[PDB]
Amino acid sequence: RSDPLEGFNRTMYNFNFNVLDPYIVRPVAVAWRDYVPQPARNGLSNFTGNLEEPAVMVNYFLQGDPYQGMVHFTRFFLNTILGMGGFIDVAGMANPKLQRTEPHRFGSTLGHYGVGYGPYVQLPFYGSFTLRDDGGDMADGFYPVLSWLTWPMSVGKWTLEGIETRAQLLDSDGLLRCSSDPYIMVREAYFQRHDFIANGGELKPQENPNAQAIQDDLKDIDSE
Amino acid sequence: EVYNKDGNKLDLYGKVDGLHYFSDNKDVDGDQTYMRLGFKGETQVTDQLTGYGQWEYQIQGNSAENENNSWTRVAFAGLKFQDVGSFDYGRNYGVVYDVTSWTDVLPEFGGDTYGSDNFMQQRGNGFATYRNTDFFGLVDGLNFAVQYQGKNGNPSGEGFTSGVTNNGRDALRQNGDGVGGSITYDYEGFGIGGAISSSKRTDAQNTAAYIGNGDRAETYTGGLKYDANNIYLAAQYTQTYNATRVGSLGWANKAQNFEAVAQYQFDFGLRPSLAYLQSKGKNLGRGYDDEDILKYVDVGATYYFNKNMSTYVDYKINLLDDNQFTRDAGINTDNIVALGLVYQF
Amino acid sequence: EVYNKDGNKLDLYGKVDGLHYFSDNKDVDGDQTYMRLGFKGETQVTDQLTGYGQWEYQIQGNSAENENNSWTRVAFAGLKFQDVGSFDYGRNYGVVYDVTSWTDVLPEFGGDTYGSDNFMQQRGNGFATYRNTDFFGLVDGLNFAVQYQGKNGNPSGEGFTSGVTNNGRDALRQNGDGVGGSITYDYEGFGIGGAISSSKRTDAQNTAAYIGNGDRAETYTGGLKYDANNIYLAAQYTQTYNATRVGSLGWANKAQNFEAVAQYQFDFGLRPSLAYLQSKGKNLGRGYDDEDILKYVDVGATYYFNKNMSTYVDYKINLLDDNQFTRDAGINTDNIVALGLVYQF
Amino acid sequence: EVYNKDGNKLDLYGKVDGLHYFSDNKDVDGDQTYMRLGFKGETQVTDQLTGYGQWEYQIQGNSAENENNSWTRVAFAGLKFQDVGSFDYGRNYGVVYDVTSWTDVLPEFGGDTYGSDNFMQQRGNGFATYRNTDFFGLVDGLNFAVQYQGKNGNPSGEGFTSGVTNNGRDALRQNGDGVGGSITYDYEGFGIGGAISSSKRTDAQNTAAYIGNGDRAETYTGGLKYDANNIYLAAQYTQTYNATRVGSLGWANKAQNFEAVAQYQFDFGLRPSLAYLQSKGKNLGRGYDDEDILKYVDVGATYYFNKNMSTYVDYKINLLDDNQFTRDAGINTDNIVALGLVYQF
Amino acid sequence: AADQTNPYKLMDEAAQKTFDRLKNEQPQIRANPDYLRTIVDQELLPYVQVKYAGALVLGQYYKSATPAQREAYFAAFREYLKQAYGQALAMYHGQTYQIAPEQPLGDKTIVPIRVTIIDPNGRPPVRLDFQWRKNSQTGNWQAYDMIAEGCSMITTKQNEWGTLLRTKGIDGLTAQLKSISQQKITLEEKK
Ligand SMILES: CCCCCCCCCCCCCC(=O)O[C@H](CCCCCCCCCCC)CC(=O)O[C@@H]1[C@@H](NC(=O)C[C@@H](CCCCCCCCCCC)OC(=O)CCCCCCCCCCC)[C@H](OC[C@H]2O[C@H](OP(=O)(O)O)[C@H](NC(=O)C[C@H](O)CCCCCCCCCCC)[C@@H](OC(=O)C[C@H](O)CCCCCCCCCCC)[C@@H]2O)O[C@H](CO[C@]2(C(=O)O)C[C@@H](O[C@]3(C(=O)O)C[C@@H](O)[C@@H](O)[C@@H]([C@H](O)CO)O3)[C@@H](O)[C@@H]([C@H](O)CO)O2)[C@H]1OP(=O)(O)O
Ligand SMILES: CCCCCCCCCCCCCC(=O)O[C@H](CCCCCCCCCCC)CC(=O)O[C@@H]1[C@@H](NC(=O)C[C@@H](CCCCCCCCCCC)OC(=O)CCCCCCCCCCC)[C@H](OC[C@H]2O[C@H](OP(=O)(O)O)[C@H](NC(=O)C[C@H](O)CCCCCCCCCCC)[C@@H](OC(=O)C[C@H](O)CCCCCCCCCCC)[C@@H]2O)O[C@H](CO[C@]2(C(=O)O)C[C@@H](O[C@]3(C(=O)O)C[C@@H](O)[C@@H](O)[C@@H]([C@H](O)CO)O3)[C@@H](O)[C@@H]([C@H](O)CO)O2)[C@H]1OP(=O)(O)O
Ligand SMILES: CCCCCCCCCCCCCC(=O)O[C@H](CCCCCCCCCCC)CC(=O)O[C@@H]1[C@@H](NC(=O)C[C@@H](CCCCCCCCCCC)OC(=O)CCCCCCCCCCC)[C@H](OC[C@H]2O[C@H](OP(=O)(O)O)[C@H](NC(=O)C[C@H](O)CCCCCCCCCCC)[C@@H](OC(=O)C[C@H](O)CCCCCCCCCCC)[C@@H]2O)O[C@H](CO[C@]2(C(=O)O)C[C@@H](O[C@]3(C(=O)O)C[C@@H](O)[C@@H](O)[C@@H]([C@H](O)CO)O3)[C@@H](O)[C@@H]([C@H](O)CO)O2)[C@H]1OP(=O)(O)O
C-alpha cells in the first residue's frame, strides 16, 4: 500500500538505526544479556505485563469477547495477589492455556471495526509509530491502575520493555541489513504485526503463501 | 478415604482458610483465618439398611494463645435404608436451609439473612430429620423431609428456675418444639423448592426487653434453581415472622427476605459470582416503622487451581444508609473487601 | 487403623453419641449429644521393648455457637517390655478403676457414684501407673499394678499462697500425693479383683465451708465378674473413707457403696441390662445421718446392629426421696429415660 | 502419610508429652502435660506448581474436666511453584524465628527471651511471609525472605472508641503495620544468618506506664551455627528495641540478649546438650538503671530410642537473684528440673 | 557429483573442481560468458539441488505450485543457479580457493559447510557458508543455504519476494528465473 511523505521518513530512519543503535543501544544490550541474570530479566518482563493486564481486558469487552475478557482478569488477579505485585508468572504455570499473551491496546479495537492507517512517521528514539495503533494508545490513561503512574516512572517502563526485547533480537540482527533497503522490510514487518485477521495484534508466526510447501515434493524436483 | 475395611469407609476432609478483611469500619477488618476439621464415615450394615455419620469443628486461628474460639458446626449420625428413606439424629441443618442452599453459593458473604440455632434456619442442636430419596423410588428429583426440634431455654443453674434445660443459652438463639418440612423437585436442570416451618417461642423470648411477640412463629420460603451448561441462576423469596435477628434486641415482627444469585463456570477455573440480597423488615413495634435489615450487592470471582485448592475474591457493595436504627442494631453499612486462600484436603 | 508402616502402627478410633433426655427434673432435661475423637498409636523399637500411646477427647454438641465445652479424657505415653511390666505417665485411669470397670458396663448410665478428678476413682491427672501382665509370665490371669499421684493445689492466677500448682483446680477436685495399687485374678469365666488406694488431702479440702475433714482418704474396693456362655454377671462392694463426693457440700466421712449388674447376650444382638446402685451414708455430718447419697435402678436393652453402629434404650428409676438433704446437695431425684443410637468408627 | 491418591498427599504428625515439673516456685510446680496435634497436606496441581498447607493444635492435658486450655500454633496456606520461592499467608513463624531457631534446640526450655505473638519474632496472626530458596535457583545455600504484618489491636466488642480489631486481645500483643526480612547462608556445616525487623505499635501499647515507650520498634538479629560430624554448635546475639517483654510491668526500651548452645549426638541414642541464656535490660524506666531480665544455663540430654520415642531430663540453673524487680514482674529466680516423655507419630 | 555420506567431503571436492575449471578455462569464460554457466553446472549445481536450495531464488514466491509455476524453482532453477555461481566465479581474476577439512557433522537436518576464498589483489576474504541439509527425498549432499562472507544471503529474497506475490501472485515470478538464467555473466573489469 502506498504511503505519503516519501521524501521524509528515510534519512531519520537511517540515522536512528545506523548511529543511535550501534553506539548506545547495542553496547547496553550486550551487558544486559550477560551481566543481568535470566531470573532478574524474567521478573521485570512479568512486572510490565501486570501493569497492562487491567487495561487490555477493557479492549476485549469493547469489541466483545467474554472468553478472552475473563482470561486477562484472572492473570492480573493471580499475579498481583499471589506474585507480590506480578514479580513472577503465577498464571503462566497455573494452566497451559493461560500463558503469556501479546497485549491488545486501544488500537486493536479501532482496527477491528475498520479504520485508516494514515501516514507513517518514524518518531525519533522510538522507532515505528502509527496514528491508528501507536497514536491511539493514549486512551488507557484514564482507567485505574494505569493512571497511578507519573511521567518519569511511566517512561522508564517503555525503556525497560525495549531493552528486554532487544536481547531476543540480538541473535537475528543480521537480517536487518541483509536487504538492499532496510526501510522497506521494517515497514512491512510492523504492518504484518498489526494487520492480521480481524486485527487482534499479530497472528501466529507463519507465511500464508505456501510456506514450506515444496519440501514435501522434492524427490522429483531436485533431480533437475 | 483413609480407612476402608470390613464394609466401613471413612472419608476424612476439611478446609483451612486464611482470610483478611479490608474495611473502614475498624470492627471486622483484619485477620479472619479459620479452619474446619471433621470426618464423614459410612458403614454398610447389610445390602439394604446402611448408615453414615458426619462431624465438623471450626477453630478460629486469628485469636491469641490465651483465648480460644471454637464451635461445632454439624454433628449427627443415623441409618439410611435402601428405598424407604433415612433418619438421622444430631446437629444437622434446618428445613429452610434445604431451599436456601441454592442462593448461598457465594464464596464468603453467604447466608447473611439468618443465623445458627435461629428457628430452624441454619445448623441446630437436637435435630431429628427423616428424609426420603426419590419418593420411595418412584420419581426422580422429588425429595421431601420432615424435621423436629427439642426444647432449649434458660441456662441451667444460673439464677433461673423456669425454662431451664441442660443446654440452655441466651434468648437470642432460643426455640421451642417445632415441626418443619421441605419439598424439592428437579426434573431436568430446573429445580423448584419450598419449605414451611413453625416453631414455638419460649417464655424468655416474650419479655419486654426485646421486640417481637407471639406464641408461634411461622416461616415461609420458596425459590427456583437452574444449574445446567455450566450456568447457575437461582433466586428465592423468604417471608418469616419473628424469626430473623435484626441485630440485637430480639427479632423483627415481620421480614420479607429476597435473595438472587448468578454464577458462571469457565473451562480454565474462573467462576464469577454476582448476587443481590434484600431484607425489608416492616411492622416494627418500636416506632422504627419500615426499615431495611440487609441490602447489598456482592461481585467477585473464584479461580479453581485444582479440585483441592482454589482462590477467590469478593467485593461487598453496601448501599444501605446508617440511620439511628442501624447503629443500635449493629449492622455494617460500608463496603467490605474479602480475599483469601482455601485448601481442602 | 490408618498407619501400618514398619513399627509405626496407629489406630484412629472414635464415636458420635446422639442422645436425648426425658425427665421431670428440668435441670437435666434436653439433649446430651457429644462425640469422642482421638488417635491410638503403637510403636516397636526392639523385639522386646514396645512403645504405645493414646489420646481421647470429648466435646458436647448440645451447646450453642457462642460457647463450647471441651476436656481431655485420657492422655498418656509410655513403654512396654516383654514379661516384666510397663510404666506410663500421664492422664490415665486409676488402679481402683481397673476393678470398677466391670460394673459400669451400661452404654450411657453407670459410674455415677463418683465424679471427675475424685482421687483414684476415675480418669485423673498426673498419674504414674506401673502395670504388669501375667505376673512376669508366671501365672495366667493374675495381674497387679501400682500407681502414684502428684500434688495439685490452688491455681497460680490468683493469690492463695500455701499449696499452689500450675494445674490448679477448685476446692472440690484437688488432691495430694498418694500411692495406690490393685490386684486382679482372671479365671476361666469367673473373675475376682481387689484394689487398695490412699491419697493425701490438701489444706484446702478440709476447711470449714466443706463437710468432711481429715488427712487421709484411704479407700478399699473389691470386685467380682463372670463373662462366659454369652452372659455377664458382676458384683462389687466397696468402702470409701472421706473420698466420696456428695452433691457440692463436700465429702462423706464414711460411705458404703454397693453395685451389681447383670447383662445377657442374644443371637440377634439384643443386650438387656439391669443394675442397682446404692450410696447410703454412715457417718455424715452437719445434721445428716444415714442419708442416701444416690440410689437408683437402671433397666434397659441394647441392640447391636454391627460392630460399628449400635442402638440402646435406658430407663433409670430413682428410689431416693426428695428431702432437704437432696435439695441442699442438688442431687437428681427424678426418673430419667434416654434413648438413641451411637456410631463408632 | 495416610492418604496418597491422584497427587493429593496428607501427612498426620504430632506428639504426646507428659511433664512433671519439680521446683520450689508455686507458679510452675506441678504437672504440665501437653499434646500437639495437626496435619500437613500437599497437593500437586501441575508439574511446575504444587500446593501445600500446615495446621497444628496444642491442648494442655494437665487441666481438669471443666476447663479448656487449647490454642492454635500454626495455620497457613500457600502455593509453591517450581523454583521462584514460596509464599504463604496465615498463622506462621516470623522472619526472626527463622534465624533464632538455631539456638532453639532444647527439648522443652530455650527461646525464653521472646514470647508468643511478640511482633515478628514467633508465631502470630495475619502473617504474610515470602521465602525464596537458593536465590531463585542461582546459588546454593543463600536464602532470603520477606514478611508482612497486619494491624491487630484492641478487641472490637469491648466498648472502646479508639482503634480496635475483631481478633483483639489484651494490651500485650497488639502490633501495627510493619515489615521485616531475613537472610541466611548455608554451607558444609557452617551457617551465617541475619534478620532485620521493624514493626509499628498501636497507641494502646503505650497508653499507661508501660516502662518502655516509642513510636517504632526495631529488631536486628544474627548468629552462627555449626551442624557437622554429629556436632551441633550455635551462638546467636541480637539487639532489640521495644520488642522484648519484660513481664507484667511493660516493655524494655533496650535489651541486649545473647544465647549459645552446644550439642554432640552420640552413636548410642543419647544426645547430651548444653546451652546458656542471658538477657540484659538497659534504659529501663521507673527508676531501673541496669538489671538482668533472664539469665540461666541449661544442662540436659535426650535419648531417642529408634526415631520417635525419647526420654529427656532437664535442669536449668537460674543465676538470677530475688529482688523487687523480679517480684513485681513475676519471674522465677530458682533452679528447676523438668522430666518429660515425648512419643511422636 | 555429490556424496551421500560425507557432506563436507563433497563440498570440498566441488569447490576444488570449480576453481580448477575456472583457471584452466579462463579465456573461455571471457570469450563466452554463457560457457562458464555450463561448466559451473557440473561443479556448483551438482553440489546444491534446486529443490533443496529453493530459498535464495523464487523461495517465497513462484515455488513449484500453481500447476504452471514450475519453471522457476524446480525445472529451470538449475540454469539460474549455475549462472549466479558463474558470475561470482568470473569476478575473481585468480583468487585462491581454500578447501575446508572434513569436519564432523553427524546425523542432523542442518549440516553447516563453509569454505575460504582469498583474493590475490588484496581484497578481504569471502567465506561461502553453504549450509547443507540431510533431505529424506534426496540422499545427495545438497546445500540448502547460500551464505557469502558470513551474511545469510539464503533468506535475502525470502522477505523481499512477498511484496510482488501479494498482487501478481505466484505467476509473476515464473518468468523471472528464465530471464536470469538466460542472462550472461558480467566479468569484473580492472580499472
Ligand atoms: C507478601 C509480600 C511480603 C512483603 C514484600 C515487600 C516488603 C514490604 C511490603 C510492605 C511495605 C509497605 C511500606 C510501609 O509499610 O510503610 C512504612 C514503612 C517505611 C518503608 C519500609 C519499606 C521496606 C521495604 C522492604 C523491601 C523488601 C523487598 C511503615 C507503615 O506501615 O506506614 C503506615 C501506613 N502504611 C501501611 O501500613 C502499609 C502500606 C499501606 C497499604 C496500601 C493500601 C492497601 C493495598 C492493598 C493490599 C494488596 C493485597 C495483597 O503502605 C502504603 O502506604 C503503600 C506502600 C505500597 C506497598 C504496600 C504492600 C502491602 C501488602 C503486603 C503484601 C501482601 C498506614 O497508613 C494508613 C493506612 O490506614 C488504613 O486503615 P483504614 O482502613 O483506613 O482505617 C489502611 N491500613 C492497612 O493496614 C491495610 C490493610 O489493612 C493491610 C493490607 C495487607 C495485609 C495482608 C493482605 C494480604 C492477604 C492475602 C490473602 C491471600 C491503609 O490503606 C487504605 O487506605 C485502605 C485499604 O488499605 C485499601 C483497600 C484494599 C483493596 C485491596 C483489594 C484489591 C484486590 C485486587 C483484585 C482485582 C493506609 O495506608 O498506617 C500508619 C499511618 O499512621 C496513621 C495514619 O496517619 O493513618 C496515624 C493515625 O491517624 C490519626 C489521624 O491523624 O487521622 C491520628 C490519631 O491521633 C487519631 O486521630 C486517629 C483516629 O482516631 C482514627 O484515624 O487517626 C491512625 O489513623 C493510624 C491507624 O489508623 C490507627 O492507629 O494510622 C503508617 O505508619 P508510618 O508511616 O510509619 O508513620
Ligand atoms: C509407676 C511407679 C509407681 C510408684 C512405685 C512405688 C509405689 C509407692 C510410691 C509411693 C510411696 C512413697 C512413700 C509415701 O508416699 O509417703 C506416705 C505413704 C506411706 C505408705 C507408702 C506405701 C507404699 C506401697 C508400696 C507397694 C509396694 C508393693 C504418704 C506421703 O505422701 O508422704 C508425704 C510426703 N512424701 C511424698 O509425697 C512421696 C515422696 C516424695 C519425694 C520426692 C522424690 C523425688 C521424685 C522422684 C522422681 C522420679 C524420677 C523418674 O517421698 C518419699 O517417701 C520418697 C520415695 C519416692 C516416691 C515417689 C516416686 C514415684 C515416681 C515413680 C517414677 C518411676 C511429702 O513430703 C514432703 C514433700 O514436699 C515437696 O514439695 P516441695 O519441695 O515444697 O515442692 C516434694 N513434693 C512432691 O510432691 C514431689 C513431686 O512433686 C512428685 C514426685 C514425682 C511423681 C511423678 C514422677 C514421674 C515423672 C516421669 C515422667 C516420665 C517432696 O520432695 C522434695 O522435697 C524434693 C522436690 O520434689 C524436688 C525433687 C528432685 C527432682 C529429681 C528428679 C531428676 C532425677 C535425675 C535423673 C538423672 C517432699 O517429700 O508430703 C507430706 C508431708 O506433709 C507436709 C510436709 O511436712 O512437707 C506438711 C506441710 O508442711 C508445712 C510446713 O512445715 O512447711 C506444715 C504445716 O503445719 C504448715 O506449717 C505449712 C506451712 O505454713 C507452709 O509450708 O506447711 C505441707 O507443706 C505439705 C505440702 O507441702 C502442702 O500441703 O507437706 C507427706 O504426707 P504424710 O507424711 O503421710 O503426712
Ligand atoms: C424424624 C421424625 C419425623 C418427623 C418428626 C415427627 C413428625 C411431626 C412432629 C409431630 C407433630 C406434632 C408436634 C407439635 O409440635 O405439636 C403441635 C403441632 C400442631 C400442628 C403442626 C403440624 C403437625 C402435623 C404436620 C404434618 C406433616 C406431614 C404444637 C405443639 O408444639 O404443642 C405443644 C405441646 N406438644 C409438643 O411439643 C409435641 C409432643 C411432645 C413430645 C411427646 C412425647 C413423645 C415421645 C417421643 C418418642 C421418641 C421416639 C423414639 O407432643 C405431642 O403432640 C405428641 C406427638 C409426638 C411428637 C414427637 C416426634 C418425635 C419423632 C422422633 C422419631 C424417632 C407441648 O406440650 C407440653 C410438653 O412439655 C414437656 O416438657 P416437660 O414435661 O415440662 O419437661 C414435654 N416436652 C418435650 O419437648 C419432649 C422432649 O423434649 C422432645 C420429644 C422427643 C424429641 C426427640 C426424639 C428423638 C430422640 C433420638 C432418637 C434416636 C412434652 O412431653 C412430656 O410431657 C414428657 C415426655 O415428652 C414424655 C415422657 C417420656 C416417655 C417417652 C420415651 C419413649 C422410650 C421408647 C422405648 C422403646 C409435652 O408435650 O408444649 C406446648 C404447651 O404449652 C405449655 C403447656 O401447657 O405444657 C404451656 C405452659 O404451661 C403452663 C402450665 O399450665 O403449667 C401454662 C402457663 O400459663 C403457666 O401457668 C406456666 C406455669 O406457671 C408453670 O408450668 O406453665 C408451659 O409449661 C410450656 C412449657 O412447659 C414451658 O414453656 O408448655 C404445646 O404448644 P401449643 O399446643 O401449640 O400451644
Secondary structure blueprint with pairings:
The complex is a heteropentamer, with one copy of chain A (224 residues), three copies of chain B (345 residues) and one copy of chain E (191 residues).
Chain A: H1 11-18, H2 20-34, H3 38-63, H4 66-82, H5 90-94, H6 106-113, H7 151-169, H8 182-192
Helix pairs in contact in A: 1-2, 2-7, 3-4, 3-6, 3-7
Chain B: E1 3-5, E2 8-10, E3 13-22, E4 30-31, E5 34-43, E6 50-60, E7 70-71, E8 75-80, E9 86-92, H1 97-100, E10 124-132, H2 134-137, E11 143-149, E12 178-186, E13 190-200, E14 216-228, E15 231-240, E16 254-264, E17 270-282, E18 291-292, E19 296-304, E20 309-318, H3 324-329, E21 336-344
Antiparallel strand pairs in B: 1-2, 2-5, 3-4, 3-5, 3-21, 5-6, 6-7, 6-8, 8-9, 9-10, 10-11, 11-12, 12-13, 13-14, 14-15, 15-16, 16-17, 17-18, 17-19, 19-20, 20-21
Chain E: H1 7-24, H2 26-31, H3 33-41, H4 77-91, E1 96-98, E2 115-118, E3 126-128, E4 132-133, E5 142-143, H5 162-165, H6 176-182
Antiparallel strand pairs in E: 1-2, 2-3, 4-5
Helix pairs in contact in E: 3-4, 4-6
The structure holds ligand KDL (3 copies).
Description of the structure:
The PDB classes it as lipid transport. Chain A has one domain. Helices cover 49% and strands 0% of the residues of chain A. Chain A is built from 8 helices and no strands. Chain B has 345 residues and is mainly beta. Chain B has 3 helices and 21 strands. Chain E has a 3-stranded antiparallel sheet, covered by helices on one side. In chain E, helix 3 packs across helix 4 and helix 4 packs across helix 6. Chain E is globular, with a radius of gyration of 17 Å. The chains are: A mainly alpha (224), B mainly beta (345), E mainly alpha (191). At the B-C interface, strand 5, strand 6, strand 7, strand 8 and strand 9 of B face strand 2, strand 3 and strand 20 of C. Bound molecules: ligand KDL (3 copies).
